[PDB]
């Protein structure tokens, strides 16, 4: 039942995202190739030009590129939950369009540690203090994501926890302009029932983790709100996914 539902969604995750958290930690701690460090202008330039052969404006462009693949991954992850696919086009568009941002940040925690973040599907590691050395308000906008992720990562979540968690962020009954509110509220309810089951089996002694995770969702929301607001003060394939 609920053990098997957790597992079904764990599969669509593994099948739809290339950088699992396991893969991430594997590289950061170096199992068996070591990421190219970017700590300054020289190394950033090498990572763009070649290792052998404005600056605020380039780090930020690179943050936006990542997103293109991430959204594609989410849309598929999403569409691979059968309940999601049984929803009407208008509902599916609304759910991805409001969810993706929270999810994109929830997942970012996977590739982030105290010292920096993995880049170029795993082959580069840009350092936190290089990122802090950028002019405002560009560094104003990257820091609150590092702060969220370090907090987030302290919760010891693993891919199978994350899979449900992302399912919960997308399938969310509060999104503005949903047509079938009660249907979305029912599915989440299930995704939530099972998240809770999962956590209390897979984190037997972390006893306030679920209500902690719920706070993280509220927290993520606020983090997007502010991200939208900060971006304002700065620049001043298939049918459905071409829409989100």
Stretch that binds ligand 1FA, among 92-100, 108-116, 153-161, 207-215 (CB under 6 A): 108-116
Cis peptide bond prior to 137, omega within 30° of 0: yes
Whichever of 133 and 207 has its CB closer to ligand 1FA, that residue is 133
244 lies in the site for ligand 1FA, by CB under 6 A = no
Contact 145, 67 (CB under 8 A): no
| Least distance in angstroms from the C-beta of 180 to ligand 1FA | 29
Contact 110, 19 (CB under 8 A): yes
Phi then psi for residue 119, to 5 deg, are: -140, 170
Phi then psi for residue 3, to 5 deg, are: -70, -35
Whichever of 59 and 157 has its CB closer to ligand 1FA, that residue is 59
141 lies in the site for ligand 1FA, by CB under 6 A = yes
- List the one residue out of 155, 160, 53, 55 whose CA is nearest residue 109: 155
Whichever of 131 and 194 has its CB closer to ligand 1FA, that residue is 131
Stretch that binds ligand 1FA, among 28-36, 54-62, 189-197, 202-210 (CB under 6 A): 54-62
62 lies in the site for ligand 1FA, by CB under 6 A = yes
Q: Which of 145, 198, 216, 244 binds ligand 1FA (CB under 6 A)?
A: 145
| Least distance in angstroms from the C-beta of 59 to ligand 1FA | 4
Compute the distance between CA of residue 195 and CA of residue 216 in angstroms, rounded to an integer.
14
Which residues in 114-149 are b (16+ Cβ under 10 Å) and which e? eebbbbeebebbbbbebbeebeeebeebbeebbebb
188 lies in the site for ligand 1FA, by CB under 6 A = no
Structure tokens, 102:
């929270």
DSSP string of 39-101?
-SHHHHHHHHH-S----HHHHHHHHHHHHHHHHHHHHHHHHTSHHHHTS-HHHHHHHHHHHHH
Positions 110 through 139 that interact with ligand 1FA (CB under 6 A): 110-111, 119, 126
- List the one residue out of 13, 228, 92 whose CA is nearest residue 220: 228
Positions 9 through 38 that interact with ligand 1FA (CB under 6 A): 17, 19, 38
Stretch that binds ligand 1FA, among 57-65, 84-92, 179-187, 213-221 (CB under 6 A): 57-65
| Least distance in angstroms from the C-beta of 167 to ligand 1FA | 14
Which residues here bind ligand 1FA, judged by CB under 6 A?
Answer: 17, 19, 38, 44, 59-60, 62-64, 66-67, 70, 104-105, 107-108, 110-111, 119, 126, 141-142, 145, 231
């Amino acid at each position: 039942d609920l053990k098997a539902f957790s597992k079904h969604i764990y599969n669509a995750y593994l099948k739809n995202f290339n950088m699992t958290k396991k893969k991430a930690r594997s590289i950061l701690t170096g199992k068996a190739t070591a990421p190219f460090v970017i700590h300054d202008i020289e190394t950033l330039w090498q990572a763009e030009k070649g290792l052998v052969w404005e600056i605020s404006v380039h780090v930020f462009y690179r943050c936006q590129c990542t997103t293109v693949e991430t959204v594609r991954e989410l849309t598929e992850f999403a569409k691979s939950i059968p309940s999601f696919s049984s929803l009407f086009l208008n509902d599916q568009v609304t759910l991805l369009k409001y969810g993706v941002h929270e999810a994109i940040f929830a997942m970012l925690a996977s590739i982030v540690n105290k010292d920096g973040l993995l880049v170029a599907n795993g082959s580069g590691f840009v350092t936190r203090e290089f990122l802090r050395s950028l002019r405002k308000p560009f560094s104003d906008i990257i820091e609150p994501k590092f702060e969220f992720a370090v907090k987030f990562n302290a919760l010891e979540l693993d891919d199978s926890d994350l899979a449900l968690f992302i399912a919960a962020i997308i399938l969310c009954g509060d999104r503005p302009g949903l047509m079938n509110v009660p249907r979305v509220e029912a599915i989440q309810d299930t995704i939530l029932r099972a998240l809770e089951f999962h956590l209390q089996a897979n984190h037997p002694d972390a006893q306030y983790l679920f209500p902690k995770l719920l706070q993280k969702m509220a927290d993520l929301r606020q983090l997007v709100t502010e991200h939208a607001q900060m971006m304002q003060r700065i620049k001043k394939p298939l049918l459905q996914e071409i829409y989100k």
